[PDB]
Design a protein around this ligand. Structure first.
Ligand SMILES: [Zn+2]
Ligand SMILES: [Zn+2]
Ligand SMILES: [Zn+2]
Length: 124
């Protein structure tokens, strides 16, 4: 067509989700992963994101895309991702939430996770 659907986006997204999902459910002494320990820092961002009540930070605003992308395939009793857990309890539209897209900035979050040299200074 003029534009193709986001099917291959899965190969790009699932790579970022392997770390996110695992780190969300990483609450155990037996849990020992490399990417996990790094991901924990990103989890602290939403943990203290008071800005959500004012709008939301770039990380938070961006992560929602992935929460919903995982929710179509994560439909369980106690979903690992804390954001998708809310999607399940609100799965009443099954359209608006699911249908989400973000620009190349989506990749920038995973870059600073390892190289904190930007402070994601929000702008207009
Ligand atoms: Zn872990
Ligand atoms: Zn935030
Ligand atoms: Zn889930």
């Amino acid at each position: 067509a003029t534009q193709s659907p986001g099917d291959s986006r899965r190969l790009s997204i699932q790579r970022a989700i392997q770390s996110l999902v695992h780190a969300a459910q990483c609450r155990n002494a037996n849990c020992s992963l490399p990417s996990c320990q790094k991901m924990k820092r990103v989890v602290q961002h939403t943990k203290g994101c008071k800005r959500k009540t004012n709008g939301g930070c770039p990380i938070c605003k961006q992560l929602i895309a992935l929460a919903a992308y995982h929710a179509k395939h994560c439909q369980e009793n106690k979903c690992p991702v804390p954001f998708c857990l809310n999607i399940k309890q609100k799965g009443t539209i099954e359209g608006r939430g699911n249908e989400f897209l973000s620009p190349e900035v989506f990749q920038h979050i995973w870059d600073f996770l390892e190289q904190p040299i930007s402070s994601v200074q929000p702008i207009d």
